[PDB]
Amino acid sequence: WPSINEFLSELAKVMPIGDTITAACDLISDGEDAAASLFGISETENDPCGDVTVLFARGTCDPGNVGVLVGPWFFDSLQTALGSRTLGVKGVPYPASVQDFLSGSVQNGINMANQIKSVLQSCPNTKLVLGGYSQGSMVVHNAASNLDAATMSKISAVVLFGDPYYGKPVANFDAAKTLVVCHDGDNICQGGDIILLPHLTYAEDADTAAAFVVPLVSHH
Ligand SMILES: CCCCCCCCO[C@@H]1O[C@H](CO)[C@@H](O)[C@H](O)[C@H]1O
Ligand SMILES: CCCCCCCCO[C@@H]1O[C@H](CO)[C@@H](O)[C@H](O)[C@H]1O
Ligand SMILES: *[P@](=O)(CCCCCCCCCCC)OCCCC
């Protein structure tokens, strides 16, 4: 799929599929946003740092800055597992566009790396956790690739749901502190572009992901 995506990305610049792709993604986002408001799901998080802080990059066409499919469930399970310890959630403000997914979301990785540095500088005592879903997992991988190992050593944990780069470790970071959740039959995890039902069910792994994070957010 890398050369397929490289070619498809060039086609997104031929004034055709460009607008067609964007509108379809915008419609999907609005539909997801309508479902969020109906069930009281918060699709936007911009909390100040807590005892634990999660910086989460949502999936393609996910509404707000955390989406509806994965992020909210993970934050709820994490806060439950943390008990009285406060969780601050910050969504990664990026377009989450099909075009950026096809091109590798390089620019978004640069921005997220700077956001990580900014959070570490502002809240040096917080236990910082990175999270991503689908394109957001790509953004997290790119962010890690843009940071030095000394900065990445300040990250307590990384949780990637439906990682398009499944098989590749998070750069400049201890893999023991990473949890990659990739379902069997998820074509996105196979480096593909096909969205299938196993890619949409990561909310079911929210408790497992929270359980992984808790021992990593210390201590002591
Ligand atoms: C239960 C079976 C229906 C699952 C429908 C999932 C909706 C996502 O739809 C998918 O979007 C992809 C976007 O890259 C396209 O490439 C796929 O062709 C399309 O099936
Ligand atoms: C079409 C969109 C797919 C929605 C299905 C999401 C899967 C629901 O998964 C649910 O997640 C919860 C964790 O947050 C768990 O408490 C439930 O046991 C689990 O079944
Ligand atoms: P990722 O960035 C996740 C994309 C999820 C799309 C959601 C489809 C809408 C279904 C709503 C269910 C009610 O995927 C990478 C490929 C992007 C092209």
Swiss-Prot record:
Instruction: Spell out the disulfide connections.
Output: 25-61, 49-123, 182-189
Protein activity control? Weakly inhibited by n-undecyl phosphonate (C11Y4). Activity unaffected by paraoxon.
> EC number(s) for this protein?
3.1.1.74
Q: Where in the cell is it found?
A: Secreted
Q: Which GO terms describe its biological process?
A: carbohydrate catabolic process
| Stretch list, region Lid covering the active site of the uncomplexed enzyme | 15-40
Q: Where is the active site?
A: 134 (nucleophile), 186, 199 (proton donor/acceptor)
**Annotated keywords:** Disulfide bond, Hydrolase, Secreted, Serine esterase, Signal
Instruction: Give the top-rank taxon of the lineage listed in the UniProt record for this protein.
Output: Eukaryota
Catalytic activity of the protein = cutin + H2O = cutin monomers
Site feature (Transition state stabilizer) residues: 60, 135
Cite a single GO MF annotation.
Answer: cutinase activity
Please tell me one Gene Ontology term that the record gives under cellular component. extracellular region
Claim: Signal is one of the keywords in the record: yes
Annotated family: Belongs to the cutinase family.
Question: What is the role of this chain?
Answer: Catalyzes the hydrolysis of complex carboxylic polyesters found in the cell wall of plants. Degrades cutin, a macromolecule that forms the structure of the plant cuticle.
Record comment regarding domains:
In contract to classical cutinases, possesses a lid formed by two N-terminal helices which covers its active site. The lid opens in the presence of surfactants to uncover the catalytic crevice, allowing enzyme activity and inhibition.
> What protein am I looking at?
Cutinase
- Source species: Hypocrea jecorina (strain QM6a)
